Amino acid sequence: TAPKVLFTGVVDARGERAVLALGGSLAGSAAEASHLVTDRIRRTVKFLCALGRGIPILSLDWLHQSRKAGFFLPPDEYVVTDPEQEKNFGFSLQDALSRARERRLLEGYEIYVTPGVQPPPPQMGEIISCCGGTYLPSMPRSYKPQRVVITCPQDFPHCSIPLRVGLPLLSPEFLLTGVLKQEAKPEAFVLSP
Amino acid sequence: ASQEY
Questions:
Q1: I need a labelling partner for A189 at 20 to 30 A (CA). Which of A70, A93, A155, A180 fits?
Q2: Chain A residues with CB inside 8 Å of B5's CB?
Q3: Where in the cell (chain A)?
């Protein structure tokens, strides 16, 4: 089927024109997208979601060069290469992409997000779903392995139940750093007093 | 622009 192309962090009017002209469409969300187009690595919801699903994450040259050719080119040579940000976050995009393609990062995870977290619960939720985790929109009331709560200092009134039932309280970085590297380390993101 | 985190 025709590509459903997502963009993040760029206005790429040239690329948008290429998408419709070549017979693809604009993706309305990471979940419906086949391709993410962008120029750099950024921790946006779309970027993390796209990585989580392990879809192609391509530079602006893919659609540009595709349009010169007259058809959607193969993605392989257009992978986003951002050595500066790969260094900044201490990971390899392509390595992280292979990980996502081999396994779902958050398989077996049930994750609740408190209301003051950034990105907000629904958007944090779409990052969780895209990694094969179960987004918990309702407050969990029992302990289960790999059942975690994402919270923050100002959400202490919301930690009341998790705390009673013995659920781990974790920083957003568990997901924001974890999804980006495609490495899940719940032990390292436990919130201290 | 889209929020970065």
A1: A93
A2: 43-45, 118-119, 172, 176
A3: Nucleus; Chromosome
Elucidation method: X-ray
If one counts every other C-beta atom within 10 angstroms of the C-beta of residue A141, the result is 10
CB of A42 less than 8 A from some CB of B: yes
Class of CATH domain A102-193: alpha beta
Taking contacts as CB-CB distances below 8 angstroms, the residues of chain A near B4 are: 9, 42-44
CA dihedral A13, A18, A23, A28 (to 10 degrees): -30
Resolution value (Å, 1 decimal): 2.4
Q: How many angstroms separate the CA atoms of A32 and A159, rounded?
A: 33
Identify the helix (H) or strand (E) that includes residue A76: none
In chain A, CATH 3.40.50.10190 covers: 1-101, 102-193
Shortest distance, CA B2 to any CA of chain A (angstroms): 6
A54: left (phi over 0), alpha (psi -120 to 50) or beta: left
Q: Which CATH number fits domain A1-101: 3.40.50.10190, 3.40.50.2300, 3.90.190.20, 2.40.50.100?
A: 3.40.50.10190
